[PDB]
Short mmCIF file of C-alpha atoms and ligand atoms in Angstrom, two decimals:
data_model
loop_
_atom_site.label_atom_id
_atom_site.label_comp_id
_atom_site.label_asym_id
_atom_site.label_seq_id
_atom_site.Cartn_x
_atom_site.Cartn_y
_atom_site.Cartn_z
CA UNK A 3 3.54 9.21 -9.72
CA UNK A 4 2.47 8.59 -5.99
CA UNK A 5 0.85 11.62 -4.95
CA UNK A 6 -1.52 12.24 -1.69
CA UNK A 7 -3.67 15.77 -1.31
CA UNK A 8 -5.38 16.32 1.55
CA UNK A 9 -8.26 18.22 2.12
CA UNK A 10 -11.06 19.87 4.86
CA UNK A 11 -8.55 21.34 7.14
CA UNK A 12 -9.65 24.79 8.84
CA UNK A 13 -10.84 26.54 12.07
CA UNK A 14 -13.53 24.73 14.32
CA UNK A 15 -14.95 25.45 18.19
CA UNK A 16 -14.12 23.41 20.60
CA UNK A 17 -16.71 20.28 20.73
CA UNK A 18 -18.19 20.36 16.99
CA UNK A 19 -16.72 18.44 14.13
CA UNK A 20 -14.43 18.20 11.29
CA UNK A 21 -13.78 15.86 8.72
CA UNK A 22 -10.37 15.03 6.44
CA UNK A 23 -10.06 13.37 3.24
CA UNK A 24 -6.90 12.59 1.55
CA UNK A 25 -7.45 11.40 -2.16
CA UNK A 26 -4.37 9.07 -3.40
CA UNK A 27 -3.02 8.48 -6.49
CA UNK A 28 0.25 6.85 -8.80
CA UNK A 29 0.17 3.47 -6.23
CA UNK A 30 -2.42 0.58 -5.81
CA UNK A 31 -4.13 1.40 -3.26
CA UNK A 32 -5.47 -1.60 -1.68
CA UNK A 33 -1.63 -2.87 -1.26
CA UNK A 34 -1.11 -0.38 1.40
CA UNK A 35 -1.72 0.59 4.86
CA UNK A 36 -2.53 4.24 5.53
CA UNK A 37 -1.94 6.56 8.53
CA UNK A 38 -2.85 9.80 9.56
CA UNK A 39 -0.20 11.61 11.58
CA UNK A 40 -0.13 15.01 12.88
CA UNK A 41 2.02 17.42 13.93
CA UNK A 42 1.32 20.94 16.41
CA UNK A 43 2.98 24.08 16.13
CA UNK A 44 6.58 23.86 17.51
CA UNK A 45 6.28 19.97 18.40
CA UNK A 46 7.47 16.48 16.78
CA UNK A 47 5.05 14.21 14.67
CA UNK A 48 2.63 12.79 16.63
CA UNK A 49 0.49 9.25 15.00
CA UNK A 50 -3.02 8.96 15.00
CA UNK A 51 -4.55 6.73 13.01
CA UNK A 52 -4.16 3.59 10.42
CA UNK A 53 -6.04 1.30 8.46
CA UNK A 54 -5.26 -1.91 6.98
CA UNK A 55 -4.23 -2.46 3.45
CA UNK A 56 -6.83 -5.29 2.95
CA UNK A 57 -9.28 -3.41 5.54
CA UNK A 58 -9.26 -5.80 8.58
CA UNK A 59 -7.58 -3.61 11.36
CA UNK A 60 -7.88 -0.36 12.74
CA UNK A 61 -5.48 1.06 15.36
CA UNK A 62 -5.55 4.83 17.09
CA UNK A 63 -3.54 7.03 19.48
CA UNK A 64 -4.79 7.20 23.43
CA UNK A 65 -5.08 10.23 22.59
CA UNK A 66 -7.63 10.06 19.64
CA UNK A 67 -9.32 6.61 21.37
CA UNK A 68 -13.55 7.30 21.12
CA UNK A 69 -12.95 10.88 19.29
CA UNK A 70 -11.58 9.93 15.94
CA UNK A 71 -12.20 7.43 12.88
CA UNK A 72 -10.04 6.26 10.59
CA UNK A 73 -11.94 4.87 6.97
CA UNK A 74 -11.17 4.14 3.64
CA UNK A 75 -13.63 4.37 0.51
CA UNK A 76 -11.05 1.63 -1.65
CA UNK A 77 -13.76 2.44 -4.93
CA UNK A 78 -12.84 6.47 -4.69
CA UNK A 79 -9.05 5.69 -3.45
CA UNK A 80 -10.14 7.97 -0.51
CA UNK A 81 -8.97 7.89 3.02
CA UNK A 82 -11.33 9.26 5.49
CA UNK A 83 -10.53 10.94 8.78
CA UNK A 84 -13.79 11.71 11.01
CA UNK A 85 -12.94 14.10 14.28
CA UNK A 86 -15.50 14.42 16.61
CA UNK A 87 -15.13 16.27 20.29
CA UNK A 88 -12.62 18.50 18.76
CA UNK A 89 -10.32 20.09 21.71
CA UNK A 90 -7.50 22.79 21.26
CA UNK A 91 -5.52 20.09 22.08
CA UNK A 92 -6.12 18.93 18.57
CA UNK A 93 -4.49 21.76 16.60
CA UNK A 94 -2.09 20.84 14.43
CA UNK A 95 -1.23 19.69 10.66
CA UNK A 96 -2.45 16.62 9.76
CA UNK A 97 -0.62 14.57 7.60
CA UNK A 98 -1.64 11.46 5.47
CA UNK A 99 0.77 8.85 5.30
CA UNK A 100 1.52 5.65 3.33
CA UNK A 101 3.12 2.74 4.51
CA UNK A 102 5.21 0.70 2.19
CA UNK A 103 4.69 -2.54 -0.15
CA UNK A 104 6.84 -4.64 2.41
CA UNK A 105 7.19 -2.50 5.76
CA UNK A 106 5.69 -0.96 8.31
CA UNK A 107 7.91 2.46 7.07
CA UNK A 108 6.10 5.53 6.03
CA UNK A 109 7.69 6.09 2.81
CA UNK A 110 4.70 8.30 0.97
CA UNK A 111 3.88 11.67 3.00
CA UNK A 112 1.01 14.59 2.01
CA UNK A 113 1.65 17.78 2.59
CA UNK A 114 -0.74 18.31 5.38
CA UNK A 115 -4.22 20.56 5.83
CA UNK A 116 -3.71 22.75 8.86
CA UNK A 117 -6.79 22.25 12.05
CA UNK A 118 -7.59 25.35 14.08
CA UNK A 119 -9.41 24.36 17.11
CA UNK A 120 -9.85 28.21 18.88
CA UNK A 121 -13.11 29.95 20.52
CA UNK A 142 6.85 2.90 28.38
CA UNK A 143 9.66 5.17 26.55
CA UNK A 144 10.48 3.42 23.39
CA UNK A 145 12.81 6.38 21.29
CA UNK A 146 14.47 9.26 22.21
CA UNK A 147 16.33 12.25 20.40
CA UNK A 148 18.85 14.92 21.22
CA UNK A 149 16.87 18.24 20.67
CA UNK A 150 19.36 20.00 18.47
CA UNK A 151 22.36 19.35 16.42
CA UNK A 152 24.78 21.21 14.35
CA UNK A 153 27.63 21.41 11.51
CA UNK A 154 29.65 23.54 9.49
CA UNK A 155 29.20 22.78 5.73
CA UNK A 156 31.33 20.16 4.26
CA UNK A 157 31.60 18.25 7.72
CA UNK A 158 29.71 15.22 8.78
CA UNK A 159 27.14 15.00 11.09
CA UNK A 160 25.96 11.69 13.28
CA UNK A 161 22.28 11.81 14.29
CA UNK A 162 21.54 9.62 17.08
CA UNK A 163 18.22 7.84 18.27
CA UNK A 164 18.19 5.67 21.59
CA UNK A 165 16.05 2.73 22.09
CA UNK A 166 14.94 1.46 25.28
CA UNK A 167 16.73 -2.16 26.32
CA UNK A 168 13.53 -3.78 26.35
CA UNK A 169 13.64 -3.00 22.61
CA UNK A 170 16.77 -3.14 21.63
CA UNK A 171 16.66 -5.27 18.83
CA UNK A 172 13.43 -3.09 17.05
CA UNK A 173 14.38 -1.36 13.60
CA UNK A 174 13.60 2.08 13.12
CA UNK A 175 12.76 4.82 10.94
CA UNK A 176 14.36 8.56 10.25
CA UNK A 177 12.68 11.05 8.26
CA UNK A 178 13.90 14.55 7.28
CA UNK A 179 11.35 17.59 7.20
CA UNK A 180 12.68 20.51 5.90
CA UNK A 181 11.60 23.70 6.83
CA UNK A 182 8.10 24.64 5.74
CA UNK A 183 7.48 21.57 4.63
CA UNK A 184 6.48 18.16 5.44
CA UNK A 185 8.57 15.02 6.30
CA UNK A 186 9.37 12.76 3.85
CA UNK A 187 11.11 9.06 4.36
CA UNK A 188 14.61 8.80 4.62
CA UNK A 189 16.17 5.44 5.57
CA UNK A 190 15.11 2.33 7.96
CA UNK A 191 17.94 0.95 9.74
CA UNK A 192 18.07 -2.16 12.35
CA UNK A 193 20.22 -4.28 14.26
CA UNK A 194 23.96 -5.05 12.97
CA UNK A 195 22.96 -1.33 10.97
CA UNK A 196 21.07 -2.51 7.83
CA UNK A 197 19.29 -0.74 5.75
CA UNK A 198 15.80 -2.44 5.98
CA UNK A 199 14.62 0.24 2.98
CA UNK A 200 15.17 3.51 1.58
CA UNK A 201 13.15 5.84 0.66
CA UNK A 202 13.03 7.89 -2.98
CA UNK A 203 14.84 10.65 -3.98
CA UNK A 204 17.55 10.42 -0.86
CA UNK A 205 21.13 11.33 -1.98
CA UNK A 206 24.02 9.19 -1.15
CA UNK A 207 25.77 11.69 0.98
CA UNK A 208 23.31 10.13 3.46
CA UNK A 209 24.16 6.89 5.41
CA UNK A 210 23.06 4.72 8.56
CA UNK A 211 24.79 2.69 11.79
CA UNK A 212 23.69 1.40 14.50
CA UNK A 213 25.91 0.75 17.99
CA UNK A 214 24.04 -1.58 20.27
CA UNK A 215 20.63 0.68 21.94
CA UNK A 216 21.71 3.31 19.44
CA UNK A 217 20.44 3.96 15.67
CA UNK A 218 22.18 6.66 13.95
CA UNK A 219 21.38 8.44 10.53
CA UNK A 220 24.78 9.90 9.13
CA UNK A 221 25.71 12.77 6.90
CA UNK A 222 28.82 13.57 4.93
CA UNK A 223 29.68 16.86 3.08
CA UNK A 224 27.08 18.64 4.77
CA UNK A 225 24.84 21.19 2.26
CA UNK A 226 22.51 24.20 3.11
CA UNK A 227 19.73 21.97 2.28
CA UNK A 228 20.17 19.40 4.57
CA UNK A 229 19.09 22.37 7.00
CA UNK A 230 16.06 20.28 8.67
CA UNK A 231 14.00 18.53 11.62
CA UNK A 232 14.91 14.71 11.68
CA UNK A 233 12.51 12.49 12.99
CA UNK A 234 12.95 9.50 14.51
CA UNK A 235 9.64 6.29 14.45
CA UNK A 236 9.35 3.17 15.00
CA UNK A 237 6.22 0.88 14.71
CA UNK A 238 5.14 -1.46 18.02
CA UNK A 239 2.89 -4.45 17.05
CA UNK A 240 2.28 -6.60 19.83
CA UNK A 241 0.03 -8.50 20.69
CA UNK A 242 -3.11 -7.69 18.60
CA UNK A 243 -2.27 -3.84 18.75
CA UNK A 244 -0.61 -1.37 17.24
CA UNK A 245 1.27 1.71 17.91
CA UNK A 246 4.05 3.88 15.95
CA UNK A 247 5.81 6.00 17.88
CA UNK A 248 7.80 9.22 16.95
CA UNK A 249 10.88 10.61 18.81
CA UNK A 250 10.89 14.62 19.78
CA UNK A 251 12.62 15.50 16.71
CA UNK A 252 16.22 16.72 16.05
CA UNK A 253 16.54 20.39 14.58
CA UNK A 254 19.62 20.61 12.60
CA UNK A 255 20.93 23.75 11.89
CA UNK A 256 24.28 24.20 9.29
CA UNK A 257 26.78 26.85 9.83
CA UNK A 258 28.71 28.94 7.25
CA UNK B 3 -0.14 -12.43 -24.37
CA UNK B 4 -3.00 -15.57 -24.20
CA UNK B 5 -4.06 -16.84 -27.70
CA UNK B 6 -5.79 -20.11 -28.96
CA UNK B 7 -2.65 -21.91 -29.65
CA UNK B 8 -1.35 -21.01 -25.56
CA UNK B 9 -0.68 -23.87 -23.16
CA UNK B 10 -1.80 -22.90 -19.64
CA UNK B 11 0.07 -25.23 -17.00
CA UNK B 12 -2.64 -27.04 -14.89
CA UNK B 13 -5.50 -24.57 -16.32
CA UNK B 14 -7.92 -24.02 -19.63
CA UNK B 15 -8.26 -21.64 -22.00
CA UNK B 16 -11.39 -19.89 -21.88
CA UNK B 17 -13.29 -17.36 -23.98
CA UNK B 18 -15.31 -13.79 -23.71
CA UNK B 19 -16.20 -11.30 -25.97
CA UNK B 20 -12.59 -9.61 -26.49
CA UNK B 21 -9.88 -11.72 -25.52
CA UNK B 22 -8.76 -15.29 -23.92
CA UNK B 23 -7.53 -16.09 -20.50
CA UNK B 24 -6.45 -19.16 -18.62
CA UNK B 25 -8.62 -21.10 -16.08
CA UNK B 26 -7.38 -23.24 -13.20
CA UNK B 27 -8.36 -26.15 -12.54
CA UNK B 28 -9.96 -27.53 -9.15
CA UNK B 29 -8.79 -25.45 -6.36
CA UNK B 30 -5.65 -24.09 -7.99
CA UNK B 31 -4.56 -20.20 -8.36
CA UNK B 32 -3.11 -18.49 -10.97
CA UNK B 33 0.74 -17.33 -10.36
CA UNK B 34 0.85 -15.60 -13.95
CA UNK B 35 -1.43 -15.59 -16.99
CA UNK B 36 -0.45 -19.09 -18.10
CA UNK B 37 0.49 -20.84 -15.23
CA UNK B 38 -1.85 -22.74 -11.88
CA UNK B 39 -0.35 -23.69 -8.79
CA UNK B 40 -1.66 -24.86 -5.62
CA UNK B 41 -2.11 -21.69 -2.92
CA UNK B 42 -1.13 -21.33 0.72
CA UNK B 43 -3.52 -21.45 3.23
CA UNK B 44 -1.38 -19.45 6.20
CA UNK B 45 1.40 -16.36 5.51
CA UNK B 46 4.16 -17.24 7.03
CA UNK B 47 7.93 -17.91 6.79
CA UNK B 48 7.67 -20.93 5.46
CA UNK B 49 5.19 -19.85 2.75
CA UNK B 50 6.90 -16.14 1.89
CA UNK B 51 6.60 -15.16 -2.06
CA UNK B 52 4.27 -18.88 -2.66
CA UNK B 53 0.80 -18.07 -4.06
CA UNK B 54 -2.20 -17.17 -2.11
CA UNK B 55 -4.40 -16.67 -4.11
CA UNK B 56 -5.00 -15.55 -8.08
CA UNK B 57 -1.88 -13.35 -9.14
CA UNK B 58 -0.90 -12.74 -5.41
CA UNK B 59 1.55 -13.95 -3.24
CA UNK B 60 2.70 -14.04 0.58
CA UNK B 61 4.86 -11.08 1.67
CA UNK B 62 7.31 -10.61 4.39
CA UNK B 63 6.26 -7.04 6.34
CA UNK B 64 9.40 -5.76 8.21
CA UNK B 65 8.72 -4.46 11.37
CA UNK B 66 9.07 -4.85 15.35
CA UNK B 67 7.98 -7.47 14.64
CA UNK B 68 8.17 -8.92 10.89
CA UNK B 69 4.65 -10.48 9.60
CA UNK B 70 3.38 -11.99 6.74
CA UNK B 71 0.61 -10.68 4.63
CA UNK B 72 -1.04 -11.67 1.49
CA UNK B 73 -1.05 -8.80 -0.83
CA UNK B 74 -1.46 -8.34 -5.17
CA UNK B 75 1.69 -8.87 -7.05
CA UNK B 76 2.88 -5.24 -9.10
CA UNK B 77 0.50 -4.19 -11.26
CA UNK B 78 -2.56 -5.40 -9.67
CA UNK B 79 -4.82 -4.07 -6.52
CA UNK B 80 -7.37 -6.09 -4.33
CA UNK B 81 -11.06 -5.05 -5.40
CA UNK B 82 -13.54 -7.06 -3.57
CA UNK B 83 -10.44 -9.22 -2.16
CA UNK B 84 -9.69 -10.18 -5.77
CA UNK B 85 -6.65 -8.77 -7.35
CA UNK B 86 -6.88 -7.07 -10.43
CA UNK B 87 -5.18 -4.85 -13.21
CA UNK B 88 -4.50 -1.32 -11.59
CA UNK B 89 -5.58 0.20 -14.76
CA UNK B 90 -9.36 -1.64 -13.81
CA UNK B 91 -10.08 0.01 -10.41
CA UNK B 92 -12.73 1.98 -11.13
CA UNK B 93 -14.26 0.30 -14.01
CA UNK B 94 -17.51 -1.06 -14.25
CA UNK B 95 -18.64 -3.67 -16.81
CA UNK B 96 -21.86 -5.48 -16.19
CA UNK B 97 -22.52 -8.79 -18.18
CA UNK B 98 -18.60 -8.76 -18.71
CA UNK B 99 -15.08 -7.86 -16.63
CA UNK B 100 -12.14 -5.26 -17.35
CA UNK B 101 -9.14 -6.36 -18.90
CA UNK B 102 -5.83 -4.44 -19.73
CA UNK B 103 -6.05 -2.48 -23.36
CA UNK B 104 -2.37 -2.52 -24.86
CA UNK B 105 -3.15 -0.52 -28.13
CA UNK B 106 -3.35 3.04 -26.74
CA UNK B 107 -0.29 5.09 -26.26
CA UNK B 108 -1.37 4.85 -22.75
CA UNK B 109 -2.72 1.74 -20.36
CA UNK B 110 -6.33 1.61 -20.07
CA UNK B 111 -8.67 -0.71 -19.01
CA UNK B 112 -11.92 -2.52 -21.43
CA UNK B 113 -14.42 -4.33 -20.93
CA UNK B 114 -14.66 -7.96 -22.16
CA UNK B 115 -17.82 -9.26 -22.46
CA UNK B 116 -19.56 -12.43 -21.34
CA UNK B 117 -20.77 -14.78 -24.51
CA UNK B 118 -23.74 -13.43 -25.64
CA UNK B 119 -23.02 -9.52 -25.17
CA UNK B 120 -21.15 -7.18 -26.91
CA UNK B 121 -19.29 -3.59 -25.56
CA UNK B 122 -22.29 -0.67 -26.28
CA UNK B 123 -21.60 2.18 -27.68
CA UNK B 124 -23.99 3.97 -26.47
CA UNK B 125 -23.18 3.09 -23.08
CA UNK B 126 -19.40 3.86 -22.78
CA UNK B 127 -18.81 0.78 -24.17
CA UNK B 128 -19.91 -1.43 -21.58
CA UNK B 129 -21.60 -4.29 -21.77
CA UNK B 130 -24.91 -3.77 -22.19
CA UNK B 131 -25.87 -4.45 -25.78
CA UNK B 132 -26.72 -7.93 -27.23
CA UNK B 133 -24.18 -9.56 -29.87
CA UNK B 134 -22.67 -13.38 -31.06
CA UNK B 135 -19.41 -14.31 -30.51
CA UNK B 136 -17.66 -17.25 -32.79
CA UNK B 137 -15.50 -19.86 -30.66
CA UNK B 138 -12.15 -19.33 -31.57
CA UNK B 139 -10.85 -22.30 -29.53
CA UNK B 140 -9.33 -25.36 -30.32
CA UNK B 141 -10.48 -28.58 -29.05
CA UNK B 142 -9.57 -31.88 -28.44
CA UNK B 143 -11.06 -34.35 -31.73
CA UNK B 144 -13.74 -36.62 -31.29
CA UNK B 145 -13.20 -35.94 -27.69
CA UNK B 146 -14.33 -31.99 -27.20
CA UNK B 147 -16.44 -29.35 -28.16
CA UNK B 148 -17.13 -26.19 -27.68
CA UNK B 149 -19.83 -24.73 -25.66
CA UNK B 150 -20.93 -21.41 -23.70
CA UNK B 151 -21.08 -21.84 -19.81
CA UNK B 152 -21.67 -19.45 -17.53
CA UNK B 153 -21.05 -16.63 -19.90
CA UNK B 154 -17.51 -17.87 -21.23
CA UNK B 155 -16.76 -20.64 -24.46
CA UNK B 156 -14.58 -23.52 -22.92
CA UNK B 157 -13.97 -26.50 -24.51
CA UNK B 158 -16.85 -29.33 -22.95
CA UNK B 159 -16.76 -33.08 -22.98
CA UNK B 160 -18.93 -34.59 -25.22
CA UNK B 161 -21.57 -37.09 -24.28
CA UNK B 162 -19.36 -41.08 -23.47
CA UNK B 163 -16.06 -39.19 -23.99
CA UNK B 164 -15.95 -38.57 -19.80
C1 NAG C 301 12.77 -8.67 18.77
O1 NAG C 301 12.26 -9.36 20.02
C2 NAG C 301 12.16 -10.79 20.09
C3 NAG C 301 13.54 -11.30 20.43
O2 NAG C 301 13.49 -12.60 21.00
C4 NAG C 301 11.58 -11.39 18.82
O3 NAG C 301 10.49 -12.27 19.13
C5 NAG C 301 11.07 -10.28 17.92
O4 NAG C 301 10.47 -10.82 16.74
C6 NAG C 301 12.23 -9.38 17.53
N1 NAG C 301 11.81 -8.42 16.52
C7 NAG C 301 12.57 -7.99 15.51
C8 NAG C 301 11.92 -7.02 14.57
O5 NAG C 301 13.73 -8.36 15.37
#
């Protein structure tokens, strides 16, 4: 079904280029918007990039702005990532990411190509959490006031591997949308500034890094922003 | 599926090579394959799952904060900004378009060719090669007739019978 490879990932100097491709497949692919996010050795996710479904917009991280561009060749269902000015800054996995039919959640994930480059507050996270096995487990995620009626996102990465979508919750603690594959042991709540994703009968594999995103679209720009990450560990 | 004897609701039948389709009239959009209806000009709230356009409709995006998009209905992507079968994204045709092929085990896309071609052999079956086509549709008596236009039959008013 939906599958995304990426591909031209390896070592580079500091100052030449480098450029990704992520080939999709198992979805239309002019229906969806598609990000690049990455992620650096020890760190959270970090976005970079996205392009509009239909082709009309593209958005990019401060961080990226001038260096980096963001295409999409809709005949070869191809997304393009061109990285020029490459800095060590820039090492990390790079992950291509589809948004959803009907939200701005990114509920499709690749498995990321690794990049070697060698010669106001909107969320917040707890660092770390932990649980014996069988218990339950309450992951929090605090909003800013100014934004306290956004929805947001949690996705679980397990170790090794990349993140994959979990749940979207908002105000009143609704699930906006779901993502595939996600067993019901998992839940959501929200209290006011706070989001929460919620565990019961707590397994070995549920062992992860849960991320916490939210997209900001005002105005005529666009942002998604990623908490620091909370590293669950289970006991027994 | 669309035959000679199918009623499309504000629309035509019309005729290629392979199969039959229906054709709205004026400035109308199709919703499905049998049925016109007039199309949005703005996504918004007011307008959320209307048409916008041929076998698409207005969608509500959640997000901080919701929009409104016009995107392809299931089954179909946006080639060119025109919304086709997924199973015809990379096709190519020529004198004709790609339709959705049924008979296989599997979904794959054909071409259909305009009046006046046939699907070549020799060419991976596009349409490339020179062949006749009988009208298979039925038209109005004393009233209608059928005639080629613009590479598809469709059934054409004869001379006083405006
Ligand atoms: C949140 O902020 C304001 C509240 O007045 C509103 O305009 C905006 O659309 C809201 N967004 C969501 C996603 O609820």
């Amino acid at each position: 079904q939906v599958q995304l490879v990426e591909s031209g990932g390896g070592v580079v100097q500091p100052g030449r280029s480098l450029r990704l491709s992520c080939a999709a497949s198992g979805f239309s692919f002019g229906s969806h918007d598609m990000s690049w996010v990455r992620q650096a050795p020890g760190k959270g996710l970090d976005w970079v990039a996205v392009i509009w479904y239909d082709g009309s917009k593209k958005y990019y991280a401060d961080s990226v702005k001038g260096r980096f561009t963001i295409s999409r060749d809709s005949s070869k269902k191809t997304l393009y990532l061109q990285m020029n000015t490459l800095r060590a800054e820039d090492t990390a996995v790079y992950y291509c990411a589809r948004a959803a039919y009907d939200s701005r959640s990114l509920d499709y994930w690749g498995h990321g190509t690794l990049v070697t480059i060698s010669s106001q507050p909107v969320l917040t996270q707890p660092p770390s959490a932990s649980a014996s096995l069988g218990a339950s487990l309450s992951l929090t995620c605090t909003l800013s006031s100014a934004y306290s009626n956004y929805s947001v996102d949690w996705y679980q990465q397990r170790p090794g591997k990349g993140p994959r979508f979990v749940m979207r919750v908002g105000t009143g603690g609704i699930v906006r949308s779901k993502g595939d594959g996600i067993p019901d042991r998992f839940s959501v709540l929200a209290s006011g500034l706070n989001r929460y994703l919620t565990i019961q009968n707590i397994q070995e594999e549920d062992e992860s890094d849960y991320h916490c995103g939210a997209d900001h679209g005002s105005g005529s720009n666009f942002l998604y922003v990623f908490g620091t990450g909370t590293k669950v560990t289970v006991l027994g | 599926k669309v035959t000679v004897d199918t009623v499309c609701k504000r629309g035509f039948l019309i005729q290629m090579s392979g199969h039959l389709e229906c054709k709205c009239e004026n400035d109308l959009v199709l919703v499905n394959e049998e049925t016109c209806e007039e199309k949005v000009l703005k996504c918004d709230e007011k307008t959320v799952n209307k048409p916008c356009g041929d076998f698409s409709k207005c969608i509500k995006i959640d997000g901080n904060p919701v929009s409104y998009a016009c995107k392809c209905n299931l089954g179909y992507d946006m080639v060119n900004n025109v919304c086709i079968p997924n199973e015809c994204k990379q096709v190519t045709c020529g004198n004709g378009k790609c339709i959705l092929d049924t008979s296989n085990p599997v979904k794959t896309g054909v071409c259909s060719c305009n009046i006046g071609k046939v699907p070549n052999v020799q060419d991976q079956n596009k349409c490339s090669k020179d062949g006749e086509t009988k009208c298979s549709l039925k038209c109005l008596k004393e009233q209608e007739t059928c005639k080629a236009v613009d590479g598809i039959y469709k059934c054409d008013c004869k001379d006083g019978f405006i």
